[PDB]
Amino acid sequence: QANTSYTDYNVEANPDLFPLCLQHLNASFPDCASGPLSLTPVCDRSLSPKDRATALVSLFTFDELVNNTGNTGLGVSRLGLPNYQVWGEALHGVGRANFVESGNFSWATSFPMPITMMAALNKTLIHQIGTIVSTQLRAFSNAGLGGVDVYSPNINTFRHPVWGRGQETPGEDAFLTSVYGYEYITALQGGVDPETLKIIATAKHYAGYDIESWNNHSRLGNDMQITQQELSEYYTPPFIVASRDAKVRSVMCSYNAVNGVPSCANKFFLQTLLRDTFEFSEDGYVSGDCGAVYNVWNPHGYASNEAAASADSILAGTDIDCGTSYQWHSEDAFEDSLVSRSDIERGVIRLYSNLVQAGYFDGEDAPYRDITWDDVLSTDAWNIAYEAAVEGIVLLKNDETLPLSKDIKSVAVIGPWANVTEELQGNYFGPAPYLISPLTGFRDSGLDVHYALGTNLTSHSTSGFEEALTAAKQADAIIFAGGIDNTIEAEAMDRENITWPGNQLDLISKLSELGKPLVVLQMGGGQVDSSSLKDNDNVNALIWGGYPGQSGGHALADIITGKRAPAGRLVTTQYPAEYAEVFPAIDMNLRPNETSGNPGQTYMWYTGTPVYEFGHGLFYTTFEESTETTDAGSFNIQTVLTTPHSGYEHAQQKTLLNFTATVKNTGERESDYTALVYVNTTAGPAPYPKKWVVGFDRLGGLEPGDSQTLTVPVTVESVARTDEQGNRVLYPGSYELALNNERSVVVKFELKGEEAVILSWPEDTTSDFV
Amino acid sequence: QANTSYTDYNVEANPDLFPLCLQHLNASFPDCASGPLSLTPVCDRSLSPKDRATALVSLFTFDELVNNTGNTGLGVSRLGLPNYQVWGEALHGVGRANFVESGNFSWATSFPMPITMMAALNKTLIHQIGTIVSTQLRAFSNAGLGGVDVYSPNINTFRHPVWGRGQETPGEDAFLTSVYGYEYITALQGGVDPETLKIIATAKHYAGYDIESWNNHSRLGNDMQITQQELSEYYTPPFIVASRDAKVRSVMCSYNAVNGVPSCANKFFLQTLLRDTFEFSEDGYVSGDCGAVYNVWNPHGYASNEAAASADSILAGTDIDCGTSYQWHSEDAFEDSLVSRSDIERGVIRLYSNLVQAGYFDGEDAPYRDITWDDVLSTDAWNIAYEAAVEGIVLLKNDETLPLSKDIKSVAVIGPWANVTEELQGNYFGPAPYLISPLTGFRDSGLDVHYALGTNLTSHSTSGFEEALTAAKQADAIIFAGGIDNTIEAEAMDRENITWPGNQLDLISKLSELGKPLVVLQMGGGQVDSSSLKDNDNVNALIWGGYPGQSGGHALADIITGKRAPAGRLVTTQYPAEYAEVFPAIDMNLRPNETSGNPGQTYMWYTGTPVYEFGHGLFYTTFEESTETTDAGSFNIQTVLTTPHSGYEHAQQKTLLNFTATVKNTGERESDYTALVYVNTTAGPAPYPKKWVVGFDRLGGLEPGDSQTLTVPVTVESVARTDEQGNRVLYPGSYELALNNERSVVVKFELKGEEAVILSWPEDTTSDF
Ligand SMILES: *[C@@H]1O[C@H](CO)[C@@H](O[C@@H]2O[C@H](CO)[C@@H](O[C@@H]3O[C@H](CO[C@H]4O[C@H](CO[C@H]5O[C@H](CO)[C@@H](O)[C@H](O)[C@@H]5O[C@H]5O[C@H](CO)[C@@H](O)[C@H](O)[C@@H]5O)[C@@H](O)[C@H](O[C@H]5O[C@H](CO)[C@@H](O)[C@H](O)[C@@H]5O)[C@@H]4O)[C@@H](O)[C@H](O[C@H]4O[C@H](CO)[C@@H](O)[C@H](O)[C@@H]4O[C@H]4O[C@H](CO)[C@@H](O)[C@H](O)[C@@H]4O)[C@@H]3O)[C@H](O)[C@H]2NC(C)=O)[C@H](O)[C@H]1NC(C)=O
Ligand SMILES: *[C@@H]1O[C@H](CO)[C@@H](O[C@@H]2O[C@H](CO)[C@@H](O)[C@H](O)[C@H]2NC(C)=O)[C@H](O)[C@H]1NC(C)=O
Ligand SMILES: *[C@@H]1O[C@H](CO)[C@@H](O)[C@H](O)[C@H]1NC(C)=O
Ligand SMILES: *[C@@H]1O[C@H](CO)[C@@H](O)[C@H](O)[C@H]1NC(C)=O
Ligand SMILES: *[C@@H]1O[C@H](CO)[C@@H](O)[C@H](O)[C@H]1NC(C)=O
Ligand SMILES: *[C@@H]1O[C@H](CO)[C@@H](O)[C@H](O)[C@H]1NC(C)=O
Ligand SMILES: *[C@@H]1O[C@H](CO)[C@@H](O)[C@H](O)[C@H]1NC(C)=O
Ligand SMILES: *[C@@H]1O[C@H](CO)[C@@H](O)[C@H](O)[C@H]1NC(C)=O
Ligand SMILES: *[C@@H]1O[C@H](CO)[C@@H](O)[C@H](O)[C@H]1NC(C)=O
Ligand SMILES: *[C@@H]1O[C@H](CO)[C@@H](O)[C@H](O)[C@H]1NC(C)=O
Ligand SMILES: *[C@@H]1O[C@H](CO)[C@@H](O)[C@H](O)[C@H]1NC(C)=O
Ligand SMILES: *[C@@H]1O[C@H](CO)[C@@H](O)[C@H](O)[C@H]1NC(C)=O
Ligand SMILES: *[C@@H]1O[C@H](CO)[C@@H](O)[C@H](O)[C@H]1NC(C)=O
Ligand SMILES: *[C@@H]1O[C@H](CO)[C@@H](O)[C@H](O)[C@H]1NC(C)=O
Ligand SMILES: *[C@@H]1O[C@H](CO)[C@@H](O)[C@H](O)[C@H]1NC(C)=O
Ligand SMILES: *[C@@H]1O[C@H](CO)[C@@H](O)[C@H](O)[C@H]1NC(C)=O
Ligand SMILES: *[C@@H]1O[C@H](CO)[C@@H](O)[C@H](O)[C@H]1NC(C)=O
Ligand SMILES: *[C@@H]1O[C@H](CO)[C@@H](O)[C@H](O)[C@H]1NC(C)=O
Ligand SMILES: *[C@@H]1O[C@H](CO)[C@@H](O)[C@H](O)[C@H]1NC(C)=O
Ligand SMILES: *[C@@H]1O[C@H](CO)[C@@H](O)[C@H](O)[C@H]1NC(C)=O
């Protein structure tokens, strides 16, 4: 929109936002002691948030209202209503506060990227970080340096491995992504629909958004063809969970179209589904992605101008425009009879319902108003970012090499990922209090370190090889830190392949033939084809370290030297190179279609051979896994569904059966243990998924000898499939619960009865209406 | 459904309900101090109503749930949750309580029917009557004799004059019907979205329902074709006001289909309009009219069986089935996977959200739990039934004959409405504490009475004629009491004509030839063609008495003797009889169409010549009417909508300007004065309405020589029209506010600027899918 020359947003993946949208605002709180509003209903603490918000907007002139239909809410000086910035970010720590150059509020804790947080498979870990981010976010708010709402979390799934933003997500599995959303949102908002909101959270991006730019398919003009079945079974569950169970107070609509219609002008998505089917809060508000309302016009061409795009987005259910479409066109839209003042007011009343519920009109004694810089120091000082990295690092391969022998007194650190700063933080990060590179990790672990760059991330020169080989000879063992970073994968930048970049592999190879202990760190969010490192016996060890944040190097060093043990596991498939070549990344169809070239997408449908599988992880010890009841027997569907469901809003929310096992440490070392429980079945229509996650746990501190019992509730909804109309359906038949990919322990069960619908999928009568 | 032989419900207008549906239930309160629920969250006053109802429904087995999806909620004995009857009535007093044979709770105050109540043009009276009914209803509830929800009020409009149930409505105008609704509902529920619901009210019948059976066109199979424009402009505004302004907790969906879809299976009506456009409470429930859900299958044929009809109605938004469709066919629907459990629980949670907010779970100490029979006696003592009748009686013709001259000491009371009991009460009525005939009216008034039946209401016989004529001659003045009653107009029974029944006119005529003073009383809800009474100069006076309730007699006599002066006005048109002959009554098109024979419907569109007019009424006195400013001047549409609207949810709720007159009693008798304020315009699209009510009021006790300020807020929204797509639009152009039908006072104003939309009307994507 603010382009200075012709820009084709069918190909360009970054909008040109006007400065008003990008303007950071100085936060203050309205005054209900003596300001113009003190004697009005908005300051009456005995009325609902909706009545108080409604009374507030009633005072505005139209000009003042429109100034507050955008993310950069300019306020109303006349009523002592401050400017308010809706655009906050908390992907993995405070992301978009008004950071001071130095001193107080110059940094906030930078936790690992979500792709790495999820790998820990510790639902409590995700919760605890949210609580920490939530507190730091409040410290910034209370020093007038931020809002009380953030555009987090990303609960899209890493469907296709090229996605430049898959690093922001809890991986390719809807079940794990759902649980991520629930724990983070409940942590951000300060409880399950609680009396006072701590921080207003925002599930993004709703929906069908999992491509930036692959082969010039710009997110801003993408129209994704998705079946009601896959929309229901895959693309929306995390949103259903955020909306229905986490009681998320906000949803951001995506840039893309789905079945002809941009998300933010999509009645079916916003009204029929989110509002009429997923029980989105009565007072909840929808925010456009920055520029998304403009995109309904340019380049989707769903609306013929920015005034019609504004009208179509408001009438569909987009409450706040991240952008300048509402602010600069909602007046045109009104004068052209495209919307009513009441339409434009609906979005603002909803926003301020949430701010009232966050104590915004309640003065200095309100909840959370007492949080200071000292709470950022104290919460950071817990070093949960270190802990998070230590739990989330994944061992893909090991032959006794790790941990490092008593013998190894010196070690050669090599590769483009050894000497790094902000590479640790992935994206949507704020200034961190420090950044410990892997190099600085090993120096601090007290081994003699010999550094050599060797190669740059995307180099074809051998210039650096000589110096690296000679450093590797000096030393007792080789740590090679390579992979990808945001120079390869970022927002507006999908990968065009899923292979290691440059000549990093060529260098790892030469280091293999030196009879030296060779450890490879594969870093980045997306997965790279490590097939060559798999079937090469001289590469001893392989670690996926994702994006491990402010203390990543202490974490990686401490895993390697065995000061801590790894238990993390992959939360995406590592596909072979050819996967990214054989069918287009903008084909949303998950089910294998031989005619098209689609081998089926995600662990659930893929009919080729992963290099490393979704769920794959290793430990510095061995586990004996087994169970009391290895056939939990039959259950009647009509019986399960027709008993009381005391404690649950929905019958299908109940535990169908526990998955139980015993897990004994039968190896050298103390360690944590992670489990991912899958189901598979021939129940329901063909085709059939291979398996699908229905739970996960992390057991802690298993000394050798020690046993702990793993207990994973399989809920009724978790084993239901989905029909051709999108209804979630319990089908009768034969089911197996398998522990990890090796199927350590198998509990079988039969669903007896007739089919039952547990969620009715509304018909889409609006998308293609004439 | 419960028919013992074939019944064609396309012609038969009464459903055959199974007894479970018709069963009265012994009301009681769950025990949150001691019962099974005491330990559960439904008994926790920290939580919202929705969280409590939800927790409650979470304890049920499916079977128990399914048993509580119909009006006759059989309860859950396992949790000590009593049976609960959703089917209460309070059209114009307590109507479906478990009345006892005699003693305490054997009657309730029976007010005049709504059609007369409205003719008073006293919105305060409508509110006070509703507060009394609310108090009496809670007295019945506290005694274990009724629920805390009622299927009231009827805010359909008396669109066509043959309608059997127009008697139940505030007449043919959408504005008056809106205000009636707002005042009755806010009175029933005990405020505007109050902390504790007094009585849950139910706006009916939504929507497009204003025919029973005319020409064998049965309400149960009628598929009415309505334009989005007229659906938005005429047929839904009272429901908009009930939902958005009064905050009604319940809405009844109608028996009929509109544009191919039964209302209780109408997603457009229940979700897109009522829930997504009209701001219906997020805890509000939709009740089906008794049988309506069955009717989706038989005879509409929208569903192909009663399980499918049940599924289709739950998924549209019909929460509670008055009937046995849900109770007996929900399981078949669930097992044939037409609905989830969760779909079936949605409706019951909504109902129980409302019962939680009515204090149903909060024990003996909650608000309204202390009301007793004592409170029925005192509210009835106030005699608002009598006041209401006095304010609602409409004087049509008069030549000074009325009031009755001090001379006249004896009177011949004649006609079929003279000696009556339950005719005073119209329909949907419980037992009265007493019923005062017109005949009893005159005996009590002190005059000597000469009663003669003359003729029966519907009669081909001259048998009683001579006896009546004798009574007349042997007396100073003749009072004829005639018209229609619920033997002509009732539920399931439209009229087939709009003319006086039998030979009442033939007899009235002969009574006029005796040159004694002759006063005529046209009774009933429907108007009846009195052109022959107008033109007959020997008919001194003509009164419309409607259905004046328990004290109708004392009201009519006190008006006629002059112990009280009338002020009421018709709230329907009195059409010529040909009106019911030229076009089919099933045509919903309000605008005149010359190709179809449609002269236009109601005062707003009627091209013909009413016998008497919507708003017509006379006083026992004369009035001088004037205003300082006859040109209010110019208002810019954009200016009016772009300023603050402090105190109002929507900008359009703001007063555009006050219509403002001076009214002086220039006659010999004290009177109340009633004003209807009409707008007419050349703005917006063609055709143009003749006019439409934007306001009304009634001023009290104007003694002769006294003057009073008439001040009627004219709201921005009340002068907005409606485009071809159904949008509510303020149009720029020329406007005039006229006082009463003679336009005693005309105030001009002009709307300048561009067309603004004040209500975006959603597109119907689901009806034709
Ligand atoms: C899965 O993930 C889990 C979640 O992350 C993980 O559990 C956590 O493990 C970590 C790492 O081992 C623990 O971290 C230590 O915590 C010590 C302080 O502990 C006390 O406070 C904690 C935080 O409490 C807040 O959050 C709770 C959880 O939501 C709330 O319920 C609390 O009310 C509280 O909230 C407050 O703040 C919030 C955010 O600001 C805010 O929302 C809220 O309103 C309120 O203001 C508690 O969690 C903890 O509770 C544990 O222990 C108690 C008993 O003490 C039990 O009753 C509990 O059940 C629970 O088990 C405590 O109350 C820190 O002292 C410690 O830091 C020191 O050591 C680290 C090394 O790790 C150093 O880097 C650091 O600098 C510190 O060193 C300094 O002090 C030491 C003193 O020993 C000294 O040696 C040194 O010289 C130096 O001076 C560390 O951060 C964390 O406590 C665990 N929390 C929870 C809840 O689980 C779990 O292990 C993982 N499990 C698996 C299977 O992987
Ligand atoms: C509103 O209605 C009145 C009728 O009450 C209209 O009055 C007519 O006006 C024209 C020109 O002003 C006169 O020549 C006619 O004699 C009037 N007719 C009658 C029957 O009074 C008036 O035009 C209408 N106003 C608008 C703005 O449409
Ligand atoms: C910006 O790009 C658009 C095409 O998306 C083009 O229509 C417009 O002219 C460009 N604006 C400027 C100022 O170059
Ligand atoms: C915020 O405050 C700073 C420091 O006083 C000031 O310089 C700046 O202009 C203010 N920002 C805005 C957007 O007004
Ligand atoms: C709206 O915002 C603009 C700046 O973008 C400002 O100049 C203007 O004063 C504001 N309008 C009103 C009426 O406050
Ligand atoms: C910075 O925060 C600290 C809390 O550790 C506080 O002592 C100090 O006053 C703050 N400094 C300023 C200049 O606000
Ligand atoms: C490592 O990176 C830093 C920071 O970008 C750089 O200044 C330094 O020269 C690099 N080299 C070594 C050997 O650390
Ligand atoms: C790596 O990149 C840096 C920055 O461009 C460059 O100066 C350096 O020489 C490169 N090193 C090698 C070994 O190519
Ligand atoms: C499979 O691919 C072919 C060609 O792309 C397509 O016509 C067919 O409909 C696809 N099947 C499905 C289930 O989409
Ligand atoms: C499942 O396990 C939980 C946790 O121990 C237990 O409370 C519950 O009774 C078990 N439910 C079933 C269905 O076995
Ligand atoms: C599930 O998969 C296992 C192996 O993964 C297979 O042997 C078994 O037959 C499958 N069970 C069902 C119910 O499909
Ligand atoms: C009742 O009427 C219906 C149709 O209206 C008919 O199908 C049914 O057979 C009748 N039932 C009995 C017992 O006659
Ligand atoms: C209501 O109570 C009466 C008197 O005890 C009893 O005869 C009657 O059966 C009860 N009604 C029901 C429907 O159980
Ligand atoms: C449902 O209602 C029937 C009466 O129509 C009754 O026999 C039965 O007890 C009820 N079922 C349950 C589970 O309460
Ligand atoms: C109505 O139906 C009856 C039989 O039910 C029939 O005899 C009569 O002719 C019909 N009447 C009209 C006015 O169409
Ligand atoms: C009837 O109501 C009166 C009101 O005063 C009360 O005293 C009396 O106790 C009641 N009678 C019965 C039998 O409840
Ligand atoms: C009025 O009619 C009733 C029967 O409806 C009769 O018992 C009563 O005596 C009548 N009164 C007179 C005065 O005829
Ligand atoms: C009027 O009807 C009643 C009851 O049917 C009957 O007693 C009486 O004979 C009728 N009277 C006349 C005058 O027709
Ligand atoms: C007028 O009536 C005729 C006759 O049925 C019909 O064809 C036409 O659609 C009607 N016109 C309008 C404007 O409704
Ligand atoms: C209109 O009249 C009301 C009637 O009481 C008065 O209070 C109000 O201030 C007046 N407002 C305007 C805009 O004339």
Closest CA to B516 of B399, B398, B439, B412: B412
Ligand nearest to the CA of A300: 3
Whole-number Å distance, alpha carbon B81 to ligand 14 midpoint, is 13
Ligand nearest to the CA of A138: 1
- Residue A271, φ and ψ in degrees, nearest 5: -90, -65
Q: Give chain A's end-to-end CA distance (angstroms, integer).
A: 30
Give the residue whose CA is nearest to atom 5 of ligand 16. Answer: B374
Q: How far is CA B21 from its chain centroid?
A: 24
Which one-letter DSSP state was computed for residue A49?
A: H
Q: How was this model experimentally determined? A: X-ray
Beta strand ranges found along A63-141 (DSSP E): 72-73, 84-85
Extract the tokens encoding A539.
Answer: 């590469």
**What residues contact residue A308 under an 8 Å CB cut-off, 6+ apart?**
A297, A333, A338
A658/A745 Cα distance (integer angstroms)? 13
CB A527 within 8 A of CB A116: no
Extract the tokens encoding A83.
Answer: 């400017």
Q: Which CATH superfamily is domain A19-375 in?
A: Glycoside hydrolase, family 3, N-terminal domain (3.20.20.300)
Q: Which of B37, B51, B58 to mutate to test the interface with A (most CBs of A within 10 A)?
A: B58
DSSP symbols for B164-215:
TTGGGSS-S-HHHHHHHHHHHHHHHHTSSS-SS-SSB-EEEEETT---S-GG
Distances (CA, A) of B641 to A420, A597, B598, B647, B650: 58, 58, 37, 14, 9
Domains A19-375 and A623-759 share a fold: no
Give the residue whose CA is nearest to atom 13 of ligand 13. Answer: B25
Which one-letter DSSP state was computed for residue A550?
A: G
B757/A430 Cα distance (integer angstroms)? 45
Q: In what order do the strands lie in the sheet with B202-206?
A: B202-206, B250-253, B285-288
- Residue B284, φ and ψ in degrees, nearest 5: -60, 140
CB A441 within 8 A of CB A556: yes
Q: In what order do the strands lie in the sheet with B623-626?
A: B623-626, B655-665, B707-715
A601/A497 Cα distance (integer angstroms)? 16
Which one-letter DSSP state was computed for residue B405?
A: P
Amino acid symbol at A176: L
What is the maximal distance between C-alpha atoms in chain B? 81
Chain A residues near residue B339 by CB distance under 8 angstroms: 757, 760
Q: Is A462 helix (H, G, I), strand (E, B) or coil?
A: coil
Nearest by CB to residue A651, choosing from B282, B341, B758, is: B341
Extract the tokens encoding B707.
Answer: 């003057």
Closest CA to B740 of B687, B679, B678: B678
Extract the tokens encoding A363.
Answer: 């003065």
Residue of B nearest to A341 (CA): B758
Q: How far is CA B263 from its chain centroid?
A: 19
- Tokens 């007094």, located at residue: B198
A27/A144 Cα distance (integer angstroms)? 4
Provide the phi-psi class of B426: left if phi over 0, else alpha when psi is between -120 and 50, else beta: left
Distances (CA, A) of A208 to A242, A266, B222: 16, 12, 44
B214/B497 Cα distance (integer angstroms)? 10
Nearest by CB to residue B343, choosing from A643, A760, A769, is: A760
The reply to whether omega before A205 is within 30° of 0 (cis) is: yes
CB A704 within 8 A of CB A669: yes
- Tokens 């239930």, located at residue: B25
Q: Alpha helices of B23-83 — where are they, by DSSP H?
A: 49-59, 62-66
Whole-number Å distance, alpha carbon B456 to ligand 18 midpoint, is 6
Nearest by CB to residue A340, choosing from B646, B757, B763, is: B757
- Is residue A142 within 8 angstroms of chain B, CB to CB? no
Minimum distance, in Å, between the CA of residue B655 and any CA atom of chain A: 15
Nearest by CB to residue B754, choosing from A271, A335, A756, is: A335
- Residue A270, φ and ψ in degrees, nearest 5: -85, -45
Amino acid symbol at A337: S
Beta strand ranges found along A462-586 (DSSP E): 478-483, 518-523, 539-546
CB A73 within 8 A of CB A326: no
Whole-number Å distance, alpha carbon B20 to ligand 13 midpoint, is 14
Provide the phi-psi class of A551: left if phi over 0, else alpha when psi is between -120 and 50, else beta: alpha
- Tokens 């709009």, located at residue: B498
Residue B593 CB–ligand 19 contact under 6 Å = yes
The full 3-state SS of A399-440, as one line of letters, equals CCCCCCCCCCCEEEEECCCCCCCHHHHCCCCCCCCCCCCHHH
Q: Which residues of A21-54 are buried (b: 16+ CB within 10 A; e: fewer)?
A: beeebebebbbbeebebeebbbbeeeeebbbbbb
Minimum distance, in Å, between the CA of residue B254 and any CA atom of chain A: 23
Amino acid symbol at B145: L
Amino acid symbol at B352: Y
A155/A204 Cα distance (integer angstroms)? 6
Window 676-735 of B, Cβ < 8 Å to A: 727, 729
A715/A724 Cα distance (integer angstroms)? 23
Q: Which of A52, A728, A730, A765 to mutate to test the interface with B (most CBs of B within 10 A)?
A: A765
Burial of B268 per CB tally in 10 Å (0-12, 13-18, 19+): buried
Distances (CA, A) of B101 to B38, B422, B431, B507: 36, 17, 10, 40
Which one-letter DSSP state was computed for residue A235?
A: I
CB A614 within 8 A of CB A118: no
- Residue B166, φ and ψ in degrees, nearest 5: -65, -30
B36/A527 Cα distance (integer angstroms)? 56
Instruction: Report the CATH architecture of B388-582.
Output: 3-Layer(aba) Sandwich (3.40)
CATH placement of domain A382-582: 3.40.50.1700
Helix axes B325-335, B341-357, angle to 10 degrees: 140
Q: Is A507 helix (H, G, I), strand (E, B) or coil?
A: helix
Extract the tokens encoding A597.
Answer: 């070239």
Handedness of CA B605, B610, B612, B617 (dihedral sign): positive
Chain A residues near residue B62 by CB distance under 8 angstroms: 641-642
Amino acid symbol at B412: A
A616/A607 Cα distance (integer angstroms)? 17
Q: How far is CA B278 from its chain centroid?
A: 20
Angle subtended at Cα A177 by Cα A171 and Cα A182, rounded to the nearest 5 degrees:
150
B459/B453 Cα distance (integer angstroms)? 12
- Side-chain half-sphere CA neighbours of A285 within 13 A: 31
B299/B370 Cα distance (integer angstroms)? 46
What B461-466 contacts at long range (C-beta under 8 Å, 24+ apart), as own/partner pairs, is B461/B503, B462/B503, B465/B507, B465/B510
Closest CA to B712 of B676, B740, B664: B676
CB A288 within 8 A of CB A321: yes
Beta strand ranges found along A136-214 (DSSP E): 203-206
B346/B551 Cα distance (integer angstroms)? 45
The full 3-state SS of A57-75, as one line of letters, equals HHHCCHHHHHCCCECEECC
Beta strand ranges found along B584-703 (DSSP E): 623-626, 631-636, 655-665, 671-681, 692-702
In this structure, the number of other CB atoms found within 10 A of the CB of residue A102 comes to 9
Amino acid symbol at A270: L
Whole-number Å distance, alpha carbon B293 to ligand 14 midpoint, is 21
- Is residue A44 within 8 angstroms of chain B, CB to CB? no
Window 301-360 of B, Cβ < 8 Å to A: 315, 334-335, 337-343
For chain A, domain boundaries: 19-375, 382-582, 623-759
- Side-chain half-sphere CA neighbours of A631 within 13 A: 5
Q: Which of A266, A268, A341, A723 to mutate to test the interface with B (most CBs of B within 10 A)?
A: A341
CB A433 within 8 A of CB A549: no
Amino acid symbol at A386: Y
Closest CA to B657 of B621, B630, B623, B688: B630
Whole-number Å distance, alpha carbon B364 to ligand 16 midpoint, is 19
A234/A239 Cα distance (integer angstroms)? 10
At B734, which helix (H) or strand (E)? strand B733-739
Amino acid symbol at A80: G
Which one-letter DSSP state was computed for residue B370?
A: T
Residues in chain A: 770
Q: Alpha helices of B68-167 — where are they, by DSSP H?
A: 114-119, 123-142
Q: Which CATH superfamily is domain A623-759 in?
A: Immunoglobulins (2.60.40.10)
Minimum distance, in Å, between the CA of residue B645 and any CA atom of chain A: 5
Q: Is B377 helix (H, G, I), strand (E, B) or coil?
A: helix
Residue B459 CB–ligand 18 contact under 6 Å = yes
Closest CA to A52 of A365, A366, A350: A350
CB A271 within 8 A of CB B762: no
CB B200 within 8 A of CB B189: yes
Residue B63 CB–ligand 14 contact under 6 Å = yes
- Looking at the CA of residue A26, tell me the nearest atom of ligand 4: 1
Residue A642 CB–ligand 1 contact under 6 Å = no
